[PDB]
Ligand binder design. Structure first.
Ligand SMILES: NC(=O)c1ccc[n+]([C@@H]2O[C@H](COP(=O)([O-])OP(=O)(O)OC[C@H]3O[C@@H](n4cnc5c(N)ncnc54)[C@H](OP(=O)(O)O)[C@@H]3O)[C@@H](O)[C@H]2O)c1
Ligand SMILES: NC(=O)c1ccc[n+]([C@@H]2O[C@H](COP(=O)([O-])OP(=O)(O)OC[C@H]3O[C@@H](n4cnc5c(N)ncnc54)[C@H](OP(=O)(O)O)[C@@H]3O)[C@@H](O)[C@H]2O)c1
Ligand SMILES: COc1cccc2c1CCC(=O)C2
Ligand SMILES: COc1cccc2c1CCC(=O)C2
Lengths: 291, 291
């Protein structure tokens, strides 16, 4: 395929995605707030447009890899007159509702809009491990599918432009919270003079087992949550809530951040106050859904 | 080995541990606040002691599998006169300083004390996947190591009775916080009518890759944290903090718990306020260590 592409935003992700698209035989025209940053991808065959307008006018497909959606408006507002007849593919983090309004902004300027959420770090872009969530108009996705697939295995979720964003934010909810918990635990262990080089392999070793620890003895958390079925015979909210209390207590004594473990503690407390101490830990979702 | 064992506390863990010890040829005498709960392990060859005193006097080794350390005091207070010359192995969650004081309480009553933290759910007890952290007097550990290994591969951390507890609390810090994040994300996706049966495999599928997504592009977090090395070339705190902001925003709009994502958000905010927006995410540990 030789569809000409425009890519705006040359952080690590933009640079890797440009390279992937070049390697697959696409002309790529790039633009960046900091043009010096384009030197690498220019050496690989990208063309540096001088202006956002020139960049947009060089592609059927305009991909954004920016910190947030405000950046999309910042860069494209001077170029709105050149959007008509093109597809904007925004591969940036923001809220679902910002995303939906941006889709409408695109339409108003005569363009189509696809939402994407890239689910791997830069070095994995364009590899068999890469995958990207997409939502928006099916015909628009299908038109550009072969081009986009170069970045990573596409997972089209449906018509709502906000849905791929919601999925990205949910994934990153788990990812960033997990990472914070690793740093929290590493700090906790640090207060007895355990180094991060010692603690992090222990912690990561445990994290590796989590899918299997969740499956043990025939538990199947998702379908169980859907059924309002939370049997506590292998672990109760009382018992795991006690541990959340112990983590808070240990954290208080350690002089470290209390907000993360207290949020977890609060999940258990709500379930107990609502009379479900005997239930499995999945019951915490009720109080999370309705605070 | 046929060392006689006493095990107090017959939740799922106590029952599984009793079974494992029986299968390895140990006499096990059990006691429980709710004796009816012992029926299963009695059918498998355990002897139900009538009283805590009788239970303690039947074993060289007294294992506790109780919700917290207060329970240990509740059950053993009437039996304190029978502790002398025995080893108490507490496999219960509590704070490190509660644990240390408990060790001294044991010594005062003429017993030795070992701290243990069991790192797998009940169905994995006694399997090749099982492991348990231990701390306390090395000679006491070495004496009972043969018996204890039946429950799971022992990981002795040193002399401080509080250290295996600190490690358990740190592990459960990661585990419970991760679980809370899964339910948080599942709730978030629920607000667009995505079922938990759909969302949880996606989220778990991402979590599966975390031990490897952190290694992409040659990152080695632990040693790097020890070296105060936080290069931001593949991901910055500014960019990941923006995503934390987006999760909070999405969560606010979704009507779900804000405390968990705001805790994570605050980790990023502190790093930026302290002038490290350009750094890798690991830098959040500084603000966690010193709130
Ligand atoms: N890094 C990852 O591992 C990863 C993984 C998947 C998804 N993502 C997402 O991918 C996107 C790109 O992230 P990244 O890590 O590659 O880079 P980043 O640090 O977010 O920077 C991306 C680009 O945004 C530009 N930018 C930011 N604010 C701007 C504004 N107001 N006006 C114009 N340009 C602006 C930067 O300009 P300058 O070059 O001039 O600074 C840069 O070119 C983000 O939305 C991120 O959440 C990242
Ligand atoms: N479940 C897991 O997957 C898991 C994995 C690793 C570690 N752990 C840890 O292992 C320990 C046991 O957990 P579990 O899930 O098997 O059981 P649990 O729900 O914590 O109950 C364990 C035992 O504690 C007893 N108990 C609680 N408070 C008591 C008190 N004040 N006086 C006397 N007995 C008291 C219960 O008595 P009754 O039988 O009369 O109610 C029961 O026998 C906990 O510390 C937990 O954190 C659990
Ligand atoms: C979806 O993957 C990411 C999103 C935001 C930041 C990061 C990633 C993956 C790799 C990493 O550690 C940094
Ligand atoms: C150390 O493993 C646990 C501690 C407390 C609760 C649970 C576990 C692991 C298995 C599970 O789903 C529930």
């Amino acid at each position: 395929d030789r569809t000409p592409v425009t890519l705006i935003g040359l952080g690590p992700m933009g640079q890797a995605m440009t390279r992937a698209l070049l390697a697959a035989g696409h002309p790529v025209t790039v633009w960046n707030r900091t043009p010096a940053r384009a030197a690498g991808v220019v050496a690989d065959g990208a063309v540096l447009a001088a202006s956002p307008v020139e960049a947009v006018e060089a592609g059927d497909l305009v991909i954004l890899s920016l910190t947030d959606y405000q950046a999309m408006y910042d860069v494209l507002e001077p170029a709105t007159g050149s959007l008509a007849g093109r597809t904007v593919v925004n591969l940036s983090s923001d809220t679902p509702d910002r995303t939906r309004a941006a889709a409408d902004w695109a339409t108003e300027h005569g363009a189509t809009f696809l939402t994407g959420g890239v689910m791997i770090p830069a070095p994995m872009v364009g590899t068999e491990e890469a995958y990207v969530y997409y939502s928006g108009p099916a015909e628009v996705f299908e038109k550009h599918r072969t081009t986009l697939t170069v970045i990573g295995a596409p997972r089209y979720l449906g018509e709502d432009t906000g849905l791929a964003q919601l999925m990205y934010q949910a994934q990153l909810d788990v990812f960033l919270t997990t990472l914070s918990s690793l740093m929290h635990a590493t700090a906790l262990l640090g207060t007895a003079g355990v180094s991060a080089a010692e603690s992090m392999p222990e912690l990561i070793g445990m994290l590796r087992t989590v899918p299997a620890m969740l499956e043990a003895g025939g538990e199947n958390p998702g379908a169980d949550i859907d059924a309002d079925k939370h049997p506590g015979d292998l672990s109760t909210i009382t018992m795991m809530g006690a541990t959340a209390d112990h983590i808070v207590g240990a954290s208080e004594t350690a002089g470290i951040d209390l907000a993360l473990p207290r949020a977890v503690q609060a999940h258990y407390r709500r379930a107990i106050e609502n009379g479900h101490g005997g239930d499995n830990w999945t019951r915490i979702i009720d109080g999370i859904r309705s605070p």
